[PDB]
Design an enzyme around this catalytic site. Structure first.
Site, PDB file in Angstrom:
ATOM      1  CB  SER B  80      -0.861  -0.069   1.210  1.00 33.00           C
ATOM      2  OG  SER B  80      -2.252   0.815   0.820  1.00 33.00           O
ATOM      3  CG  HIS B 105      -4.316  -2.541  -1.727  1.00 29.72           C
ATOM      4  ND1 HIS B 105      -3.131  -2.391  -1.065  1.00 29.72           N
ATOM      5  CD2 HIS B 105      -5.091  -2.164  -0.647  1.00 29.72           C
ATOM      6  CE1 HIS B 105      -3.120  -2.193   0.088  1.00 29.72           C
ATOM      7  NE2 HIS B 105      -4.494  -1.726   0.420  1.00 29.72           N
TER       8      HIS B 105
HETATM    9  C1  LIG Z   1      -1.828   3.967  -0.800  1.00 30.28           C
HETATM   10  C2  LIG Z   1      -3.392   3.720  -0.279  1.00 30.28           C
HETATM   11  C3  LIG Z   1      -3.858   2.770  -1.136  1.00 30.28           C
HETATM   12  C4  LIG Z   1      -3.323   3.842   0.919  1.00 30.28           C
HETATM   13  C5  LIG Z   1      -3.750   2.314   1.731  1.00 30.28           C
HETATM   14  N1  LIG Z   1      -4.645   2.495   2.868  1.00 30.28           N
HETATM   15  C6  LIG Z   1      -5.766   3.420   2.820  1.00 30.28           C
HETATM   16  O1  LIG Z   1      -6.751   3.601   1.972  1.00 30.28           O
HETATM   17  C7  LIG Z   1      -5.775   4.254   4.205  1.00 30.28           C
HETATM   18  C8  LIG Z   1      -6.616   3.078   5.377  1.00 30.28           C
HETATM   19  C9  LIG Z   1      -7.385   3.849   6.320  1.00 30.28           C
HETATM   20  C10 LIG Z   1      -6.715   4.326   7.451  1.00 30.28           C
HETATM   21  C11 LIG Z   1      -7.518   4.966   8.363  1.00 30.28           C
HETATM   22  C12 LIG Z   1      -8.828   5.118   8.254  1.00 30.28           C
HETATM   23  C13 LIG Z   1      -9.590   4.789   7.062  1.00 30.28           C
HETATM   24  C14 LIG Z   1      -8.754   4.203   6.015  1.00 30.28           C
HETATM   25  N2  LIG Z   1      -6.924   5.246   3.745  1.00 30.28           N
HETATM   26  C15 LIG Z   1      -6.999   6.241   4.775  1.00 30.28           C
HETATM   27  O2  LIG Z   1      -5.793   6.718   5.318  1.00 30.28           O
HETATM   28  C16 LIG Z   1      -8.148   7.033   4.904  1.00 30.28           C
HETATM   29  C17 LIG Z   1      -8.016   8.099   5.964  1.00 30.28           C
HETATM   30  N3  LIG Z   1      -9.427   8.634   5.865  1.00 30.28           N
HETATM   31  C18 LIG Z   1     -10.271   8.800   5.151  1.00 30.28           C
HETATM   32  C19 LIG Z   1      -9.862   7.742   4.053  1.00 30.28           C
HETATM   33  N4  LIG Z   1      -8.878   7.004   3.838  1.00 30.28           N
HETATM   34  B1  LIG Z   1      -2.283   1.557   2.147  1.00 30.28           B
HETATM   35  O3  LIG Z   1      -3.005   0.678   3.170  1.00 30.28           O
HETATM   36  O4  LIG Z   1      -1.524   2.405   2.597  1.00 30.28           O
END
Ligand SMILES: CC(C)C[C@H](NC(=O)[C@H](Cc1ccccc1)NC(=O)c1cnccn1)B(O)O
Ligand SMILES: CC(C)C[C@H](NC(=O)[C@H](Cc1ccccc1)NC(=O)c1cnccn1)B(O)O
Ligand SMILES: CC(C)C[C@H](NC(=O)[C@H](Cc1ccccc1)NC(=O)c1cnccn1)B(O)O
Ligand SMILES: CC(C)C[C@H](NC(=O)[C@H](Cc1ccccc1)NC(=O)c1cnccn1)B(O)O
Ligand SMILES: CC(C)C[C@H](NC(=O)[C@H](Cc1ccccc1)NC(=O)c1cnccn1)B(O)O
Ligand SMILES: CC(C)C[C@H](NC(=O)[C@H](Cc1ccccc1)NC(=O)c1cnccn1)B(O)O
Lengths: 219, 180, 179, 181, 180, 181, 181
Positions: B80, B105
């Site tokens: 990620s 992903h």
């Molecule tokens: C590089 C991209 C794919 C990021 C990937 N992870 C995420 O999508 C992360 C996982 C997560 C963490 C905390 C709360 C909600 C979601 N996404 C976020 O940081 C995030 C945070 N607030 C709203 C929406 N997404 B990966 O695991 O780093």
């Protein structure tokens, strides 16, 4: 002997007194020079007060650049080219206040933080430093023409944006003089007119580090 | 510490889950090494499971901001966010060890966030803004077309280091100095 | 006492191979490569294993460094730790006489949920993890990977005297005093 | 020395974490020490915070407005809730943000339910409207908006990209990278 | 610390539950004291409730490996794993205090481990390999016949120090220096 | 050195956290050390506390009244319950508050239910009225109110803005910013 | 140096927390060190404790009675059972309390139910009456009361204000402030 400073100013009261590399003195030598700045006095060991009231006292410091010169500043920030001079002034004036007692800096009429030499000024430094080389070749019945394409190649290869004109002095030494000094000793450029044209021409632009100077004498 | 010896030789170390604690450390490490030597390359070791998009783009923007070129090295895992940070290094750099696991992903929400449908229209417009930004970022660092990144990060795309080089995540698979 | 071991170039696995433990050992392996790249790093292994990317983080680093790695199994090398035990240099890789080498195929700790397209990939990865664990444990044991697959089908506990016959270690470590 | 200590030595306070009573008290201690060290040299504030906490916001907010040093706020990856108000709270001609920073402005909330009589809840709601109006009044003289525009925009979560937090008035410049990489 | 003064006079100290944390400490302590003086005896104080077979045989093999003779001293308890380490000292050594409680019993599984019957055929062949090794180890250190050890460690066999000397676990019951 | 240590070196105690037995014992240790260092130079007290605890209040209250040094209380973002009484407990001609500070005065409560016989609860209620009357008597000679006005006003949560905590007598001046920013 | 270390350097032990086996063992270590440093200079004991624990009480009690140094007990905000006995346990002509301190005396209790046979509970009740009688005997030769008066008064929670803990004999003087403030 009344001291190196107090005599030279007592002989010549109207003087320019350069205290070069002032931060390299011990911090208790400024305190001797405090009342030189405010009263124009420095009583020597013999007891004669020397008139500094007609001197131009110049202190020279590298404080606030003996490091910050290196580009980039710890952290994020806007601008560069004229905000790295404001970054220079803030760095230098804070290193002066850190290093000097505030009553020393209170007594200085003007603190001038100097500009880094721009690319257009290093071009004009080439005219000023070839004139020292050409002035020496006048004593050898020679002349030194330096073509305007060769002024640009020295100006690129001599331009460091954080040192300025002393690296250019090295490039004029390495590329003009060290090559011209053997041509004099080969007697291939004796009393004539050294033209110094560029050959690869460095296309006049882009890098020119595949380019080379050629020295030929006529007349 | 052995980490202090790595940081003395200008190696920042990701190591852990990319969160607000880990991103804030790496940005502090990236800016100190920019101030020490702005012309000498910072090396970034990545063994992270990723996670966190604003913690990603905090690390991402800082390693793009600094004047020092970033040599990213994937250790065992660049999942990620970690894989976006792995591609975020300088071209001609971005190593990975031969058994590293690059996992790209699309962004997710860890757990459910509740709310009105106007609240969730915005949390979904953001997770598509996070998705498009993750695919735009991973396109100018991999040379892909973002639409290819969107089709490939539709699911978990685990890349071996030899096929993360073909993908454009890394540029060379890191040969061992001794055979052993 | 660990600092005295590290001063004499002995890294120490000791604990569960996870992201915390792999990151420590890789820091220890690279410092000892920088101190003496020609003097052998010794690796003491008393680990229950676990973690495949933490395995291959330690594995690649101890293969990367110029220093030959002398792995020594203390009481246990399980799962990821038995692969690290075989990962030492040939002519090295000791184990104490009552060490317990345990090789078995990779697992998922707990259930990971998802759509069947998500689980087709988490299973293609656990077979990629399995094949890599058997490929790694084949060029370090001299086996044929298919023999590794048949043997790590279940838990294969090896005594040190039969982990030498298996190719995990090269010598069973004789005691310096009888006692 | 920590890398944070090297940042604080070069006058960079660092928000970093959830704005609460622990984090606000640290930053106010950091802001006043740097006012005492150099009151004329600019304090830089790095913001990677998810926000939260209104009295912890206005503790940090008033202190960075109190000090003689101009505050250069820099959003790192996120300025949410209370942290986006602190991001706008920097000096005009300052207030940078990195190009993929996420500025999130929204109205104050209550984390969880607070119980009580309806006279108790009339006051906890007059306060959350006083907190809302103060959050919109604060974010109006720092963004140049009309507080009523702030109220219509922070009705929901308003996520701003850094390029459109500059158009909004939260930041003044989107921070260009020093090397392309 | 008072433990540092004991280690300076070459006394390792078991003290706690024999697990992966405690075995790794003692092996580090045994090898440092082998490097300091390989000819001067390491003393081992045992007040442990035991547990852990690979942590046992990690400590066991290391205290058998080192050139220094190991003087084991049971303090209040040596209960399985620790009673094997108590017998693991050098003959002519292996003291125990007069009210020490030596407890020998066969290996167990703490809690249930699940699995297919082919998985459990191997976890039982191992717990019999652990049992036979625990009885083989406690036979060449006690002078018993392993089959006597198997009949005696069928259940919990609590030994008083005066009858752990008759059993061969220890060699002398440690007389007090002052009557008090 | 911590930034808190630099504040304490310049004679600033720092409330910061929930007033409990741990926090009251720290502040009383800080108040007496600064009395011993300079008994004639003013101790400054920064208050960002949610309050709570009455015997922890009156431990801090009596100590900052005991010391020879005048106490300059400064409310940072919040002075709630026990902390608003400590905010009024500073010296007259002192007791600042930042312009967006939230002074919250209300009557003492029991956090959770305490069980017992009705003779036990007659005493736990005579104490919570003794705690209430003492909280209103203390907040009357420091605000200039009539205690009965304090009882009518702290009947519910009374949130005071700093500009109307000055009119109430909790603070004496609302703290002007040194730079506009 | 901590502010507590500066207090201990000037021979002030500090109760502060819940009287338990951890807190009693600290104070007894502090009382004996200060007996060894200066056996003729008075140890001061600051009490802000909620009490609890009878053997932890009588561990502190016997040690502050054992040492040659006179103990100056000072109640800060609270001396509950156990801590109020330690407050009375100081030397006569000493035993201060701050003017808004809360002295709380009450009979010993069992925190929670202890199960057992009725022969086990006959002994746990003969002990809690031995603990009660000892708490009333101890608080009688330090207050000048008749123990039977202590038994009638500690029948329930008896909260004493410092001005009426002086009339009760718990303390000897209510501690006047050095500055009015
Ligand atoms: C590089 C991209 C794919 C990021 C990937 N992870 C995420 O999508 C992360 C996982 C997560 C963490 C905390 C709360 C909600 C979601 N996404 C976020 O940081 C995030 C945070 N607030 C709203 C929406 N997404 B990966 O695991 O780093
Ligand atoms: C030498 C190799 C086989 C290492 C083996 N490790 C594993 O089985 C571990 C067990 C585990 C741990 C965490 C999460 C899921 C699974 N395998 C992994 O690390 C793992 C991680 N992600 C996906 C699949 N497997 B060991 O247990 O045999
Ligand atoms: C910039 C402003 C709006 C800060 C906002 N903060 C809040 O919503 C927070 C969320 C919160 C936290 C703790 C307890 C109750 C509520 N608001 C408050 O701090 C708060 C505190 N007490 C009463 C009402 N609101 B952020 O979430 O938008
Ligand atoms: C000398 C021998 C008998 C050591 C004894 N210890 C054990 O029986 C322990 C108890 C235990 C601990 C963890 C997990 C499962 C079982 N045996 C083992 O360590 C063990 C570990 N894996 C499989 C089977 N047994 B004793 O109780 O200390
Ligand atoms: C103290 C004055 C200013 C008013 C308010 N006090 C309280 O509500 C607090 C809340 C609380 C804390 C612990 C146990 C029971 C109750 N009241 C007390 O300190 C308290 C303590 N014991 C008995 C009765 N009240 B405020 O501080 O919350
Ligand atoms: C009356 C004086 C002596 C002290 C007051 N109460 C006690 O005596 C305390 C109350 C208490 C505290 C903690 C745990 C159990 C019981 N008595 C005891 O410590 C106690 C201990 N064991 C048996 C019976 N009572 B107060 O609660 O400190």
């Amino acid at each position: 002997e009344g001291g190196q400073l107090t005599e030279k100013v007592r002989r010549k009261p109207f003087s320019v007194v350069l205290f070069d590399a002032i931060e390299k003195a011990h911090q208790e030598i400024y305190n001797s020079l405090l009342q030189v700045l405010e009263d124009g006095r420095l009583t020597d060991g013999q007891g004669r007060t020397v008139d500094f009231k007609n001197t131009v006292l110049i202190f020279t410091s590298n404080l606030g650049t003996s490091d910050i010169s290196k580009p980039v500043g710890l952290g994020f920030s806007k601008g560069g080219g004229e905000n790295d001079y404001e970054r220079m002034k803030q760095k230098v004036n804070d290193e002066l206040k850190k290093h000097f007692r505030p009553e020393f800096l209170n007594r200085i009429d003007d603190i001038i933080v100097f500009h880094q030499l721009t690319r257009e000024e290093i071009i004009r430094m080439v005219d000023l430093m070839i004139s020292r080389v050409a002035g020496q070749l006048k004593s050898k019945d020679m002349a030194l023409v330096l073509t305007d394409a060769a002024k640009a190649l020295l100006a690129k290869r001599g331009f460091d944006p954080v040192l300025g004109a002393r690296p250019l002095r090295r490039t004029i030494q390495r590329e003009i003089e060290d090559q011209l000094s053997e041509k004099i000793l080969f007697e291939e450029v004796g009393p004539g007119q050294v033209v110094t044209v560029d050959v690869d021409n460095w296309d006049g632009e882009g890098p020119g580090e595949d380019a080379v100077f050629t020295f030929t004498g006529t007349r | 510490n052995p980490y202090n010896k790595l940081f003395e030789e200008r190696i920042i170390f990701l190591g852990v889950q990319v969160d607000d604690a880990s991103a804030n450390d790496i940005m502090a490490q990236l800016l100190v090494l920019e101030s020490l030597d702005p012309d000498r390359d910072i090396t970034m070791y990545i063994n992270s499971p990723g996670g966190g998009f604003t913690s990603l783009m905090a690390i991402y923007d800082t390693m793009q901001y600094v004047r020092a070129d970033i040599q990213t090295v994937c250790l065992g895992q660049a999942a990620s966010a970690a894989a976006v940070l792995l591609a975020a290094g300088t071209p001609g750099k971005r190593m990975a060890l031969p058994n590293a696991r690059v996992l790209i992903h699309q962004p997710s929400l860890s757990g459910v966030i509740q709310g009105q449908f106007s609240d969730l229209e915005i949390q979904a417009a953001e997770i598509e803004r996070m998705r498009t930004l993750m695919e735009t970022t991973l396109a100018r660092h991999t040379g892909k077309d973002a639409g290819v990144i969107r089709k490939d990060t539709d699911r978990d795309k685990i890349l071996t280091a030899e096929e993360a080089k073909d993908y454009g995540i890394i540029d060379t698979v890191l040969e061992y100095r001794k055979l052993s």
